[PDB]
Write an enzyme that holds these catalytic residues in place. Structure first.
Site, PDB file in Angstrom:
ATOM      1  N   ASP A  13       0.896  -1.280  -0.112  1.00  0.00           N
ATOM      2  CA  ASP A  13      -0.065  -0.058   0.259  1.00  0.00           C
ATOM      3  C   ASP A  13       0.776   1.269  -0.065  1.00  0.00           C
ATOM      4  OD1 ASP A  13      -1.905   1.879   0.273  1.00  0.00           O
ATOM      5  OD2 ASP A  13      -2.553   1.261   2.302  1.00  0.00           O
ATOM      6  N   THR A  14       1.059   1.985  -0.974  1.00  0.00           N
ATOM      7  CA  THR A  14       1.903   3.040  -1.213  1.00  0.00           C
ATOM      8  C   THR A  14       0.990   4.208  -0.476  1.00  0.00           C
ATOM      9  OG1 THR A  14       1.011   3.685  -3.399  1.00  0.00           O
ATOM     10  CG2 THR A  14       2.963   2.391  -3.477  1.00  0.00           C
ATOM     11  N   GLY A  15      -0.011   4.306  -0.270  1.00  0.00           N
ATOM     12  CA  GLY A  15      -0.848   5.362   0.329  1.00  0.00           C
ATOM     13  C   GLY A  15      -0.812   5.321   1.760  1.00  0.00           C
TER      14      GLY A  15
HETATM   15  C1  LIG Z   1      -9.703   5.502   0.402  1.00  0.00           C
HETATM   16  C2  LIG Z   1     -10.544   4.186   0.360  1.00  0.00           C
HETATM   17  C3  LIG Z   1     -11.014   4.006  -1.165  1.00  0.00           C
HETATM   18  C4  LIG Z   1     -11.650   4.375   1.328  1.00  0.00           C
HETATM   19  N1  LIG Z   1      -9.622   2.953   0.699  1.00  0.00           N
HETATM   20  C5  LIG Z   1      -9.013   2.942   1.808  1.00  0.00           C
HETATM   21  O1  LIG Z   1      -8.778   3.526   2.631  1.00  0.00           O
HETATM   22  C6  LIG Z   1      -8.346   1.342   1.706  1.00  0.00           C
HETATM   23  C7  LIG Z   1      -9.147   0.297   2.750  1.00  0.00           C
HETATM   24  C8  LIG Z   1      -8.306  -0.957   3.094  1.00  0.00           C
HETATM   25  C9  LIG Z   1      -9.262  -1.946   4.060  1.00  0.00           C
HETATM   26  C10 LIG Z   1      -8.803  -1.191   5.603  1.00  0.00           C
HETATM   27  C11 LIG Z   1      -7.495  -1.172   5.699  1.00  0.00           C
HETATM   28  C12 LIG Z   1      -6.742  -0.026   4.840  1.00  0.00           C
HETATM   29  C13 LIG Z   1      -6.724  -0.705   3.441  1.00  0.00           C
HETATM   30  C14 LIG Z   1      -5.988   0.312   2.570  1.00  0.00           C
HETATM   31  N2  LIG Z   1      -6.758   1.317   1.932  1.00  0.00           N
HETATM   32  C15 LIG Z   1      -5.978   2.656   1.631  1.00  0.00           C
HETATM   33  C16 LIG Z   1      -4.940   3.242   2.290  1.00  0.00           C
HETATM   34  O2  LIG Z   1      -3.888   3.425   1.490  1.00  0.00           O
HETATM   35  C17 LIG Z   1      -5.273   4.497   3.018  1.00  0.00           C
HETATM   36  C18 LIG Z   1      -5.475   5.682   2.209  1.00  0.00           C
HETATM   37  C19 LIG Z   1      -5.687   6.787   3.045  1.00  0.00           C
HETATM   38  C20 LIG Z   1      -4.587   7.647   3.042  1.00  0.00           C
HETATM   39  C21 LIG Z   1      -4.503   8.943   3.648  1.00  0.00           C
HETATM   40  C22 LIG Z   1      -5.641   9.244   4.595  1.00  0.00           C
HETATM   41  C23 LIG Z   1      -6.926   8.239   4.583  1.00  0.00           C
HETATM   42  C24 LIG Z   1      -6.818   7.169   3.898  1.00  0.00           C
HETATM   43  N3  LIG Z   1      -4.328   4.556   4.248  1.00  0.00           N
HETATM   44  C25 LIG Z   1      -4.571   4.497   5.329  1.00  0.00           C
HETATM   45  O3  LIG Z   1      -5.468   4.217   5.646  1.00  0.00           O
HETATM   46  C26 LIG Z   1      -3.007   5.038   6.200  1.00  0.00           C
HETATM   47  C27 LIG Z   1      -3.076   4.333   7.327  1.00  0.00           C
HETATM   48  C28 LIG Z   1      -1.745   4.532   8.028  1.00  0.00           C
HETATM   49  N4  LIG Z   1      -0.769   4.106   7.598  1.00  0.00           N
HETATM   50  O4  LIG Z   1      -1.806   5.310   9.172  1.00  0.00           O
HETATM   51  N5  LIG Z   1      -3.265   6.191   6.502  1.00  0.00           N
HETATM   52  C29 LIG Z   1      -2.404   7.435   6.372  1.00  0.00           C
HETATM   53  O5  LIG Z   1      -1.075   6.932   5.903  1.00  0.00           O
HETATM   54  C30 LIG Z   1      -2.646   8.945   6.475  1.00  0.00           C
HETATM   55  C31 LIG Z   1      -1.706   9.733   6.089  1.00  0.00           C
HETATM   56  C32 LIG Z   1      -2.295  10.884   6.428  1.00  0.00           C
HETATM   57  C33 LIG Z   1      -3.213  11.220   7.237  1.00  0.00           C
HETATM   58  C34 LIG Z   1      -3.942  12.384   7.392  1.00  0.00           C
HETATM   59  C35 LIG Z   1      -4.705  13.047   8.213  1.00  0.00           C
HETATM   60  C36 LIG Z   1      -5.632  11.734   8.807  1.00  0.00           C
HETATM   61  C37 LIG Z   1      -5.354  10.348   8.409  1.00  0.00           C
HETATM   62  C38 LIG Z   1      -4.256  10.192   7.761  1.00  0.00           C
HETATM   63  N6  LIG Z   1      -3.864   8.976   7.420  1.00  0.00           N
END
Ligand SMILES: CC(C)(C)NC(=O)[C@@H]1C[C@@H]2CCCC[C@@H]2CN1C[C@@H](O)[C@H](Cc1ccccc1)NC(=O)[C@H](CC(N)=O)NC(=O)c1ccc2ccccc2n1
Ligand SMILES: [Cl-]
Lengths: 99, 99
Positions: B25-27
């Site tokens: 997960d690059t995000g």
């Molecule tokens: C965006 C959406 C389409 C809803 N998809 C998803 O969210 C799916 C869901 C999957 C099932 C549950 C567990 C996570 C996976 C991975 N993902 C994506 C995944 O890439 C998701 C994208 C994202 C990035 C930034 C902020 C919010 C959301 N990342 C995350 O959920 C990671 C978790 C971490 N490492 O702390 N969050 C962040 O790295 C991150 C960065 C900046 C922030 C700023 C404010 C608030 C929150 C912030 N979270």
């Protein structure tokens, strides 16, 4: 083009005629953008991630530019803290994960 | 190997001596694994994503194998829906986004 991951892979996008920054996210199924006016028809959706779900507006067939690459696809608009480009558009701009 | 993104980029990982599946997960800034018994010292942390924050156990200096590559770094363990490998370990195995 190759992007290392020591920093967030943020790129500039153009959507609805406005420039924004967005995260290239291989872990996201969908593309999610912060609240903005977008013209056109949409339908309600809920999408889930690490802290649970948010309500979004689903817009189909949106024209978007991502780091200079054109795309057309579904964009979800709602209270994400970061704009996210997910796999539905990463496949159109040709991104791959090389490891 | 190069991963296209037509499907979720799921790989096998080894943590605590147990094989699991996890999302590349690059995000994600961090690596979050589903609740499991994992030896090692930890401390509480909140981590956030869409939907808000969850409370996790932060384990430093954990040995993990990701698609055959050994890495050592911080792992968060908690009630995530999906196991995710974030940038703190993707960088360690040399993963890049290409396009
Ligand atoms: C965006 C959406 C389409 C809803 N998809 C998803 O969210 C799916 C869901 C999957 C099932 C549950 C567990 C996570 C996976 C991975 N993902 C994506 C995944 O890439 C998701 C994208 C994202 C990035 C930034 C902020 C919010 C959301 N990342 C995350 O959920 C990671 C978790 C971490 N490492 O702390 N969050 C962040 O790295 C991150 C960065 C900046 C922030 C700023 C404010 C608030 C929150 C912030 N979270
Ligand atoms: Cl607006």
């Amino acid at each position: 083009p190759q992007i290392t991951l020591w920093k967030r892979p943020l790129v500039t996008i153009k959507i609805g005629g406005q420039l924004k920054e967005a995260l290239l996210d291989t872990g996201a199924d969908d593309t999610v953008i912060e609240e903005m006016s977008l013209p056109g028809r949409w339908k309600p959706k809920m999408i889930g991630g690490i802290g649970g779900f948010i309500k979004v507006r689903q817009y189909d067939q949106i024209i978007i530019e991502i780091a200079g690459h054109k795309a057309i696809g579904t964009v979800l608009v709602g209270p994400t803290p970061v704009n996210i480009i997910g796999r539905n558009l990463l496949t159109q701009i040709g991104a791959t994960l090389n490891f």
